């Protein structure tokens, strides 16, 4: 019943790296540092986890846009405390 570690690593980062709240969305470039995985596998795992509702979208005015992780995603951080 743990996740697991391969894609779920993104969700790890956040998790002890205090990136978790609706107000501040990161960036894939950030993320692609601190995720030890480059720029395309960190943007296919942000595709899948819309789908699982962790992570959800802002929108692009000249900047491009970033992705903010839910409150639901913290519960399943809770669980692995």
Known sequence: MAVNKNEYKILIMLKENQC???????TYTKLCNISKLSMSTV????????????????CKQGISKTFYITPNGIEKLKSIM
Not at 20 to 26: A, G, I, Q, R
């Open 20 to 26: 978790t709240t609706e107000l501040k969305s990161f």
């Open 43 to 58: 943007r296919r795992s942000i595709k899948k986890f819309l789908e699982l509702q962790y992570v959800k979208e802002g």
